[model samples]
Target: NLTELSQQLHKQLTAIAALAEMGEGGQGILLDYLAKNVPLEKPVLAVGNVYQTLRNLEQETITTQLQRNYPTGIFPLQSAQGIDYLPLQEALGSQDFETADEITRDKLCELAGPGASQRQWLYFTEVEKFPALDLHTINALWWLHSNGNFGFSVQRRLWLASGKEFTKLWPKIGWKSGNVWTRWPKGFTWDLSAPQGHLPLLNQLRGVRVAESLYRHPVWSQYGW
Candidate 1:
């Protein structure tokens, strides 16, 4: 693991260094200008001396401090209804999106109340009543463990860019095809290779509005987002 970490660190440093050397060149004007006025482009190779890169680079307070901040190697489970988020967190950390998605559905039922819990489903009414804090907690766990790739907020973030149109959003997030819904337990993707915001999958068997309610929840804006 340490060897892997060293290689990863070396790669990051090399990339940073190459960018730095380019920043100090005549073409550096485009780099500096791009910092403010954004235009898109293609990628290229990073070739530079590591030490040279370091010398030309700007310095900042070490906040590998932040990476080191969580040596515990586990994302804490936070729940507002006294419900356990551990099952969901574990499945997600293990990259088991199918398991984590089921846990997410059950957890939402727990929030909806005992009746919904017993039925293992949720109603849109109960969803509007969901405490922003609990959803925030669930979103936090999902976002952190998946490297911000899977979460309600991630879905919403992507959805917002889709013009709030479910037709566009569903396919963008890998939930549907041209005219059909993606089948559960088989058609869905269960790994990081799945589209971003594709995990913690929603259920549409009951109705479509329930899924809409979840994406519309206030938790995102209420929390840090």
Candidate 2:
């Protein structure tokens, strides 16, 4: 099974590929896809990492503006934003329309501003008190800090192999940003356990490796970050 660090490292590989594509004049594939799906007449501004860039057009700008302008109205999220909303819904494991509505609303508010973080924290605190909730949201938060959805499902099996019970528990705890990857889930690592059910994902995870040569270059160190 794949560990979270391995997943993050896998994303590093994807980032490299994406960077290469951008360098090779092929990055327009994404922009073209965006044009077909999430088209904009106005130019979009990019910021921070790829994760933020992915949300820039809708979630980063429009969603926040809506919250600032209207806090009580329904959260408006466009499905065309290229986000894996299906997996996000899967992570939440909730079909409750109201709960889903609240989650989306809270997500938009979380992106609104500095003050919004406090509200998001309060929302999460309330969630932690609920028995019906799953760790998908927490796992997602962990996933984001470790480069978000870059590596995708490849790292999921590693987490699954930590044992069924462990997999069920990875999302309950909070982790520090810099050290979370190393913080093993309850002292269990993927080196020992073999989760047969998710071996395919584990295989995919195994294929997720990054080249060390690039990091050895001075320019790599200076530019890759």
Candidate 3:
């Protein structure tokens, strides 16, 4: 467990460090300049780090928040990581900027301008093609970009279930489904779940969004079964 924690920490921290370093570079500096003029009054915080931010900021955040807010947004059976599903709507509907601002303050600001998008960070694979490392890393990346955190979780139901299927969908270009890892590029096991056994990442952060999503998901609509 500690080993897995260390691995994830290394990846998230390194990604963060690199992102910070980019701020000192030419293009990054320029973008920061623009962001600064429109700078947020609050400091941007993150539960963890990622190599990049999201591709669609408003759309991603809005859609992700909807899943977190409504019970229909997340699955219930295994939760703890779906909290983000709820608070999202509140943040969006905040009467004053403080609520939304404070809530988002902890989120990492998406880099803007040339090459600042997370497209480079999104690695595609035929569904289930993710190996242990691939799964862990991807989870970290998603948390970093979407919720600004990390954990071992199962919230895909937000996009997979029939009703809320639109929450997240695989591009027609590539999509597959099997076991933890199966039916992939012929030579790859696509296991995107934690291979860390029963261990948790030492510094793993539980985002409000994660919990919210889980609460809303159908698996556990009610507090207790």
Candidate 4:
């Protein structure tokens, strides 16, 4: 397994590093190829280097392409009254998960309007009332930001696959130990190097009184979670 994985990493890195020498157009073409071929749902045992490289070239290219294609007041996902997904894409392009997370939480809260409470799980009523567009927007942002490494659907699959056992899911995602949340921010793994399920912060809401509300939400079911 180690040897095979090493070769896999080597091939991916080689393709990535080649972009540094390639001209701008060539780099863009390579990034397009990589984006199409690299399925984000695949589990990555080691992603620190890959993610860093993507942040530098691949991400910039992909995001630039997105903007060029979608330069407008509303993105494809917009409805009569839906959250703007463009800003989230911009934040992801910057490759700062901290900023991305902030944008996500703030947007959700804004959509929730007086319904959202700080420092606590959202009420089940509020959760049920959340706009489907907003949830889709949030999930799409996380997926794009992490190159599919983190998202509600990603976490939801793991959550259900484990029979909804938070204990098992936590460690898999680098979120918990014996029952304790690692120290906030400092204790959390914030890089691509973190174990699977470690990011996007949305799923880390364990022990919050209203956390259970999501379990009954329709979003997961809609996504095959």
Q: All models: lDDT?
A: 0.62, 0.29, 0.28, 0.56
Model 3 lDDT tens row, 128-196: 222233223223323333333212232443333435342122221123232222222342222223221
In terms of TM-score, which candidate is stronger, 3 or 4?
4
In the range 62-121, model 1's lDDT, one tens digit per residue, is 113212422222334456678888677556545567787888888898888889989887
Alpha-carbon runs more than 4 Å astray in model 2 = 1-24, 39-125, 128-160, 165-225
Clash pairs of candidate 4? none
Candidate 4 residue runs with Cα over 4 Å from true position? 1-21, 28-55, 58-80, 117-121, 203-210, 221-225
Give RMSD to native, each candidate.
11.8, 18.3, 20.6, 6.9
How does model 2 score by TM-score? 0.24
How well does model 2 score by local distance difference test? 0.29
The candidate that achieves the highest lDDT relative to the unseen native structure: 1
lDDT of 3 at 115: 30
The C-alpha TM-scores of every prediction are: 0.67, 0.24, 0.19, 0.66
Query: For candidate 4, lDDT tens digit of each residue in 1-225?
Result: 223333454356554455534666545544454444343333331232343344566555554654454343112344325557666656655567767776766766666665473643455567667766567656655664564677666766777778987677777777787678777778876665766656667544445333445545676666443
Candidate 3, residue 50: the lDDT equals: 22
Model 1: how far residue 4 lies from native, Å: 16
lDDT tens per residue, model 2, 23-46: 223233333333342222211211
- State the displacement of the C-alpha of residue 215, model 3, in Å, after optimal TM-score superposition: 7.5
TM-score top scorer: 1
